[PDB]
Amino acid sequence: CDIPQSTNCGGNVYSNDDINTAIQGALDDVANGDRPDNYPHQYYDEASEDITLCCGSGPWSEFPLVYNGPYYSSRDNYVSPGPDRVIYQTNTGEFCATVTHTGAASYDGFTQCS
Ligand SMILES: Nc1ncnc2c1ncn2[C@@H]1O[C@H](CO)[C@@H](OP(=O)(O)O)[C@H]1O
Ligand SMILES: [Ca+2]
Ligand SMILES: [Ca+2]
Ligand SMILES: [Cl-]
């Protein structure tokens, strides 16, 4: 669905530019450091997290939502991912939601940003 003007992720407020930049960076695949699991990562629905997506069907992916993005990595060089994410439909890039680890119900959980 439409990228929102803003979102409040556990206190961090991001713009539509920040959200678009994250998905564009994910699709460009700018995270290439030697984490064995570089971003983007798969996103799965976990009903207990109470997260609603606005895109259609999966598969879904998630990528760090950061200021002055995109988040990126290379050998020996990492932006900090922080707690905040964009979720998008893997096949298309279509925006699904913003989520965060901040304030989540359980360890490693996500909760929906505003
Ligand atoms: N619904 C979900 N909730 C939390 N983590 C999820 C998820 N779907 C996929 N993940 C994955 O689990 C990691 C957290 O332990 C996430 O990594 P990141 O925390 O975003 O670095 C996803 O890889
Ligand atoms: Ca990558
Ligand atoms: Ca859900
Ligand atoms: Cl990475």
Short mmCIF file of N, CA and C and ligand atoms in Angstrom, two decimals:
data_model
loop_
_atom_site.label_atom_id
_atom_site.label_comp_id
_atom_site.label_asym_id
_atom_site.label_seq_id
_atom_site.Cartn_x
_atom_site.Cartn_y
_atom_site.Cartn_z
N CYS A 1 0.87 -1.23 0.00
CA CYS A 1 0.00 0.00 0.00
C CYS A 1 0.89 1.26 0.00
N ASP A 2 0.26 2.44 -0.02
CA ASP A 2 1.05 3.70 -0.12
C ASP A 2 2.02 3.81 1.05
N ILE A 3 3.24 4.26 0.76
CA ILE A 3 4.18 4.52 1.81
C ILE A 3 3.68 5.74 2.61
N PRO A 4 3.60 5.62 3.94
CA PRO A 4 3.08 6.74 4.72
C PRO A 4 4.07 7.89 4.85
N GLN A 5 3.54 9.10 5.04
CA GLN A 5 4.36 10.28 5.25
C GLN A 5 5.36 10.08 6.38
N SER A 6 4.91 9.43 7.45
CA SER A 6 5.74 9.17 8.62
C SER A 6 5.34 7.88 9.30
N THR A 7 6.21 7.42 10.19
CA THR A 7 5.91 6.32 11.09
C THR A 7 6.70 6.55 12.37
N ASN A 8 6.14 6.14 13.50
CA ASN A 8 6.82 6.21 14.79
C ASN A 8 7.10 4.77 15.23
N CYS A 9 8.37 4.38 15.13
CA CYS A 9 8.82 3.05 15.49
C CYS A 9 9.48 3.09 16.84
N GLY A 10 8.71 2.76 17.87
CA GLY A 10 9.27 2.72 19.22
C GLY A 10 9.96 4.01 19.62
N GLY A 11 9.46 5.15 19.17
CA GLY A 11 10.05 6.45 19.46
C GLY A 11 10.86 7.09 18.37
N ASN A 12 11.38 6.29 17.43
CA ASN A 12 12.12 6.79 16.26
C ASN A 12 11.15 7.10 15.15
N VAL A 13 11.10 8.36 14.77
CA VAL A 13 10.19 8.79 13.72
C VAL A 13 10.90 8.83 12.38
N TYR A 14 10.37 8.11 11.40
CA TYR A 14 10.93 8.05 10.06
C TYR A 14 9.95 8.64 9.05
N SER A 15 10.49 9.07 7.90
CA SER A 15 9.71 9.65 6.82
C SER A 15 9.46 8.65 5.71
N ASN A 16 8.56 9.03 4.81
CA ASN A 16 8.38 8.28 3.58
C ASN A 16 9.68 8.10 2.83
N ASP A 17 10.54 9.12 2.83
CA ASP A 17 11.83 8.99 2.18
C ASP A 17 12.66 7.88 2.82
N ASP A 18 12.70 7.85 4.15
CA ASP A 18 13.45 6.81 4.85
C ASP A 18 12.93 5.40 4.46
N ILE A 19 11.60 5.24 4.43
CA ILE A 19 10.98 3.96 4.13
C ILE A 19 11.29 3.53 2.70
N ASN A 20 11.08 4.43 1.74
CA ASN A 20 11.40 4.14 0.34
C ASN A 20 12.87 3.80 0.19
N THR A 21 13.74 4.58 0.83
CA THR A 21 15.17 4.37 0.73
C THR A 21 15.55 2.97 1.20
N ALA A 22 14.92 2.52 2.28
CA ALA A 22 15.19 1.17 2.79
C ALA A 22 14.81 0.09 1.77
N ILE A 23 13.62 0.18 1.17
CA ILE A 23 13.21 -0.84 0.21
C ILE A 23 14.10 -0.78 -1.03
N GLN A 24 14.39 0.43 -1.52
CA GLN A 24 15.27 0.59 -2.69
C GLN A 24 16.65 -0.03 -2.39
N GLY A 25 17.17 0.19 -1.19
CA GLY A 25 18.44 -0.39 -0.81
C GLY A 25 18.40 -1.90 -0.74
N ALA A 26 17.31 -2.44 -0.19
CA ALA A 26 17.11 -3.89 -0.16
C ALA A 26 17.11 -4.47 -1.56
N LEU A 27 16.37 -3.86 -2.48
CA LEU A 27 16.28 -4.37 -3.84
C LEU A 27 17.61 -4.24 -4.58
N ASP A 28 18.35 -3.16 -4.33
CA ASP A 28 19.67 -2.98 -4.89
C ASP A 28 20.70 -3.92 -4.26
N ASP A 29 20.35 -4.54 -3.15
CA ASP A 29 21.20 -5.47 -2.42
C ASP A 29 22.49 -4.81 -2.00
N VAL A 30 22.39 -3.78 -1.18
CA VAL A 30 23.56 -3.03 -0.73
C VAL A 30 24.16 -3.56 0.58
N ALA A 31 23.58 -4.61 1.15
CA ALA A 31 24.12 -5.24 2.36
C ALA A 31 24.88 -6.51 1.97
N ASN A 32 26.19 -6.36 1.87
CA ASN A 32 27.05 -7.44 1.39
C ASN A 32 28.23 -7.78 2.27
N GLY A 33 28.18 -7.37 3.52
CA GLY A 33 29.20 -7.73 4.46
C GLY A 33 29.20 -9.22 4.69
N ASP A 34 30.11 -9.65 5.53
CA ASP A 34 30.21 -11.07 5.81
C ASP A 34 29.40 -11.49 7.08
N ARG A 35 28.26 -10.86 7.41
CA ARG A 35 27.28 -11.58 8.25
C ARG A 35 26.94 -12.82 7.44
N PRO A 36 26.78 -13.99 8.08
CA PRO A 36 26.27 -15.06 7.20
C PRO A 36 24.82 -14.78 6.76
N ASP A 37 24.07 -14.06 7.58
CA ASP A 37 22.71 -13.66 7.18
C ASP A 37 22.67 -12.16 6.95
N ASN A 38 23.21 -11.71 5.81
CA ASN A 38 23.07 -10.29 5.47
C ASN A 38 21.63 -9.96 5.22
N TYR A 39 21.31 -8.69 5.41
CA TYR A 39 19.98 -8.20 5.07
C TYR A 39 19.82 -8.08 3.55
N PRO A 40 18.59 -8.14 3.03
CA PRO A 40 17.33 -8.38 3.73
C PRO A 40 17.22 -9.79 4.30
N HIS A 41 16.31 -9.90 5.26
CA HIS A 41 15.94 -11.18 5.85
C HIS A 41 14.49 -11.51 5.48
N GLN A 42 14.11 -12.78 5.49
CA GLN A 42 12.71 -13.11 5.33
C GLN A 42 11.94 -12.62 6.56
N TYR A 43 10.71 -12.14 6.30
CA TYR A 43 9.76 -11.81 7.33
C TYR A 43 8.62 -12.81 7.27
N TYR A 44 8.25 -13.39 8.41
CA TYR A 44 7.11 -14.30 8.51
C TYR A 44 6.08 -13.73 9.44
N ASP A 45 4.81 -13.99 9.13
CA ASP A 45 3.78 -13.64 10.08
C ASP A 45 3.90 -14.50 11.34
N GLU A 46 3.79 -13.85 12.48
CA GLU A 46 3.72 -14.52 13.77
C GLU A 46 2.52 -13.88 14.45
N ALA A 47 1.38 -14.58 14.48
CA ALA A 47 0.11 -13.95 14.85
C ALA A 47 0.17 -13.24 16.19
N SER A 48 0.90 -13.81 17.14
CA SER A 48 0.98 -13.25 18.47
C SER A 48 1.59 -11.85 18.51
N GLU A 49 2.33 -11.46 17.48
CA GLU A 49 2.90 -10.12 17.40
C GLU A 49 1.89 -9.04 17.03
N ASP A 50 0.72 -9.44 16.55
CA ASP A 50 -0.34 -8.47 16.23
C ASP A 50 0.08 -7.43 15.19
N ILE A 51 0.72 -7.90 14.13
CA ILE A 51 1.15 -7.06 13.02
C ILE A 51 0.27 -7.30 11.80
N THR A 52 -0.28 -6.21 11.27
CA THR A 52 -1.08 -6.21 10.05
C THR A 52 -0.25 -5.63 8.91
N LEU A 53 -0.19 -6.36 7.80
CA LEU A 53 0.46 -5.87 6.59
C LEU A 53 -0.58 -5.28 5.66
N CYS A 54 -0.16 -4.36 4.79
CA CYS A 54 -1.07 -3.75 3.82
C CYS A 54 -0.77 -4.14 2.37
N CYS A 55 0.22 -4.98 2.18
CA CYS A 55 0.49 -5.48 0.88
C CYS A 55 -0.32 -6.76 0.81
N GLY A 56 -0.19 -7.43 -0.31
CA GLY A 56 -0.85 -8.70 -0.45
C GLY A 56 -0.02 -9.80 0.18
N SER A 57 -0.21 -10.97 -0.39
CA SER A 57 0.44 -12.22 -0.04
C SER A 57 1.95 -12.15 0.03
N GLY A 58 2.52 -13.03 0.84
CA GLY A 58 3.94 -13.23 0.80
C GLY A 58 4.37 -13.91 -0.47
N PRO A 59 5.68 -14.16 -0.62
CA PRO A 59 6.71 -13.97 0.42
C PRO A 59 6.99 -12.51 0.76
N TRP A 60 7.39 -12.30 2.01
CA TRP A 60 7.75 -10.99 2.51
C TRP A 60 9.21 -11.00 2.98
N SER A 61 9.82 -9.82 2.90
CA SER A 61 11.18 -9.56 3.36
C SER A 61 11.20 -8.34 4.26
N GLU A 62 12.28 -8.19 5.01
CA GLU A 62 12.45 -7.03 5.85
C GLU A 62 13.90 -6.57 5.77
N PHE A 63 14.07 -5.27 5.98
CA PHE A 63 15.36 -4.60 5.83
C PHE A 63 15.43 -3.47 6.84
N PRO A 64 16.63 -3.15 7.36
CA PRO A 64 16.72 -2.10 8.36
C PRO A 64 16.21 -0.75 7.86
N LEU A 65 15.47 -0.09 8.75
CA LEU A 65 14.97 1.26 8.57
C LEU A 65 15.83 2.18 9.41
N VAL A 66 16.63 3.01 8.74
CA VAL A 66 17.62 3.87 9.37
C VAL A 66 17.56 5.26 8.74
N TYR A 67 18.08 6.23 9.47
CA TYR A 67 18.21 7.58 8.95
C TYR A 67 19.33 7.64 7.91
N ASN A 68 19.20 8.55 6.96
CA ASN A 68 20.26 8.83 6.02
C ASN A 68 20.72 7.53 5.36
N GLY A 69 19.73 6.75 4.95
CA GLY A 69 19.97 5.44 4.40
C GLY A 69 20.39 5.43 2.95
N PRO A 70 20.46 4.23 2.36
CA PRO A 70 20.05 2.97 2.99
C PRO A 70 21.07 2.45 3.99
N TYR A 71 20.60 1.61 4.89
CA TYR A 71 21.48 0.67 5.58
C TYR A 71 22.30 -0.07 4.53
N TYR A 72 23.59 -0.26 4.79
CA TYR A 72 24.44 -1.01 3.89
C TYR A 72 25.53 -1.68 4.71
N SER A 73 26.21 -2.61 4.06
CA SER A 73 27.38 -3.26 4.65
C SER A 73 28.31 -3.71 3.54
N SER A 74 29.58 -3.79 3.87
CA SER A 74 30.58 -4.37 3.01
C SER A 74 31.58 -5.10 3.92
N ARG A 75 32.59 -5.71 3.33
CA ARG A 75 33.59 -6.42 4.11
C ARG A 75 34.15 -5.48 5.19
N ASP A 76 34.13 -5.91 6.44
CA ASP A 76 34.73 -5.13 7.52
C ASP A 76 34.02 -3.78 7.74
N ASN A 77 32.76 -3.60 7.32
CA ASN A 77 32.14 -2.29 7.38
C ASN A 77 30.63 -2.41 7.48
N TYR A 78 30.07 -2.08 8.62
CA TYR A 78 28.65 -2.20 8.81
C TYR A 78 27.98 -0.96 9.38
N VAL A 79 26.93 -0.46 8.72
CA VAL A 79 25.99 0.45 9.39
C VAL A 79 25.33 -0.37 10.50
N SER A 80 24.96 0.27 11.60
CA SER A 80 24.20 -0.44 12.62
C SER A 80 22.75 -0.71 12.17
N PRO A 81 22.23 -1.97 12.19
CA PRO A 81 20.83 -2.16 11.74
C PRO A 81 19.82 -1.49 12.63
N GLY A 82 20.12 -1.38 13.91
CA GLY A 82 19.16 -0.87 14.88
C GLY A 82 17.94 -1.75 14.99
N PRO A 83 16.88 -1.23 15.62
CA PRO A 83 15.71 -2.04 15.95
C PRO A 83 14.58 -1.98 14.92
N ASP A 84 14.64 -1.05 13.97
CA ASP A 84 13.48 -0.72 13.12
C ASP A 84 13.61 -1.32 11.72
N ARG A 85 12.48 -1.68 11.13
CA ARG A 85 12.47 -2.38 9.85
C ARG A 85 11.35 -1.89 8.95
N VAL A 86 11.60 -2.03 7.65
CA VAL A 86 10.52 -2.02 6.64
C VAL A 86 10.26 -3.44 6.22
N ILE A 87 8.98 -3.77 6.01
CA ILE A 87 8.56 -5.05 5.44
C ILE A 87 8.05 -4.74 4.04
N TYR A 88 8.45 -5.56 3.08
CA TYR A 88 8.00 -5.38 1.71
C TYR A 88 7.76 -6.77 1.11
N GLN A 89 7.01 -6.81 0.01
CA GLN A 89 6.72 -8.04 -0.71
C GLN A 89 7.96 -8.37 -1.55
N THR A 90 8.56 -9.54 -1.32
CA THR A 90 9.85 -9.85 -1.92
C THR A 90 9.84 -9.73 -3.45
N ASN A 91 8.78 -10.21 -4.08
CA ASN A 91 8.75 -10.32 -5.55
C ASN A 91 8.71 -8.96 -6.22
N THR A 92 8.20 -7.94 -5.52
CA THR A 92 7.79 -6.68 -6.14
C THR A 92 8.41 -5.41 -5.53
N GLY A 93 8.74 -5.46 -4.24
CA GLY A 93 9.11 -4.27 -3.49
C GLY A 93 7.94 -3.53 -2.86
N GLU A 94 6.71 -3.97 -3.08
CA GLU A 94 5.59 -3.19 -2.58
C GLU A 94 5.63 -3.15 -1.05
N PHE A 95 5.41 -1.95 -0.53
CA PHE A 95 5.43 -1.69 0.89
C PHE A 95 4.34 -2.45 1.64
N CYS A 96 4.72 -3.05 2.78
CA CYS A 96 3.77 -3.79 3.62
C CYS A 96 3.53 -3.16 4.99
N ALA A 97 4.59 -2.73 5.67
CA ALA A 97 4.50 -2.21 7.02
C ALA A 97 5.85 -1.72 7.48
N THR A 98 5.83 -0.95 8.56
CA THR A 98 7.02 -0.75 9.37
C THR A 98 6.80 -1.41 10.73
N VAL A 99 7.86 -2.06 11.21
CA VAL A 99 7.86 -2.80 12.46
C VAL A 99 9.15 -2.49 13.22
N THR A 100 9.15 -2.87 14.49
CA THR A 100 10.31 -2.62 15.33
C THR A 100 10.47 -3.71 16.38
N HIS A 101 11.72 -3.94 16.77
CA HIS A 101 12.02 -4.74 17.95
C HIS A 101 11.76 -3.97 19.25
N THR A 102 11.74 -2.64 19.20
CA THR A 102 11.54 -1.83 20.39
C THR A 102 10.13 -2.06 20.95
N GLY A 103 10.07 -2.39 22.23
CA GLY A 103 8.77 -2.56 22.87
C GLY A 103 8.04 -3.83 22.49
N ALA A 104 8.74 -4.77 21.86
CA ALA A 104 8.07 -6.02 21.42
C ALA A 104 7.71 -6.90 22.59
N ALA A 105 6.73 -7.78 22.38
CA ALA A 105 6.15 -8.62 23.44
C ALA A 105 7.09 -9.67 24.01
N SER A 106 8.08 -10.11 23.23
CA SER A 106 8.99 -11.18 23.66
C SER A 106 10.34 -11.01 22.96
N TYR A 107 11.35 -11.73 23.44
CA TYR A 107 12.71 -11.63 22.89
C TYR A 107 12.71 -11.89 21.38
N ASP A 108 13.38 -11.01 20.65
CA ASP A 108 13.48 -11.03 19.19
C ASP A 108 12.18 -10.73 18.46
N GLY A 109 11.11 -10.43 19.20
CA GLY A 109 9.86 -10.14 18.56
C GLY A 109 9.85 -8.79 17.86
N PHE A 110 8.89 -8.67 16.94
CA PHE A 110 8.51 -7.41 16.33
C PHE A 110 7.16 -6.96 16.86
N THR A 111 6.97 -5.64 16.87
CA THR A 111 5.68 -5.02 17.07
C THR A 111 5.51 -3.92 16.01
N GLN A 112 4.25 -3.59 15.70
CA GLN A 112 4.01 -2.70 14.57
C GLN A 112 4.34 -1.24 14.96
N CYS A 113 4.97 -0.50 14.07
CA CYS A 113 5.13 0.94 14.27
C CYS A 113 3.77 1.63 14.01
N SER A 114 3.67 2.91 14.36
CA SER A 114 2.42 3.64 14.12
C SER A 114 2.16 3.91 12.63
N1 LIG B 1 7.72 -12.01 12.62
C1 LIG B 1 8.98 -12.04 12.98
N2 LIG B 1 9.35 -11.62 14.21
C2 LIG B 1 10.62 -11.56 14.64
N3 LIG B 1 11.68 -11.94 13.94
C3 LIG B 1 11.39 -12.41 12.70
C4 LIG B 1 10.06 -12.46 12.14
N4 LIG B 1 10.10 -13.00 10.90
C5 LIG B 1 11.37 -13.24 10.68
N5 LIG B 1 12.17 -12.91 11.74
C6 LIG B 1 13.64 -13.17 11.74
O1 LIG B 1 14.04 -13.45 13.09
C7 LIG B 1 15.07 -12.53 13.46
C8 LIG B 1 14.85 -12.18 14.90
O2 LIG B 1 15.20 -13.18 15.83
C9 LIG B 1 14.92 -11.37 12.48
O3 LIG B 1 16.16 -10.72 12.27
P1 LIG B 1 16.36 -9.18 12.39
O4 LIG B 1 15.97 -9.14 13.96
O5 LIG B 1 15.45 -8.26 11.78
O6 LIG B 1 17.82 -8.93 12.34
C10 LIG B 1 14.47 -12.05 11.20
O7 LIG B 1 15.61 -12.61 10.54
CA CA B 2 22.62 -9.00 0.96
CA CA B 3 -0.49 -10.64 11.44
CL CL B 4 24.29 -7.00 6.63
#
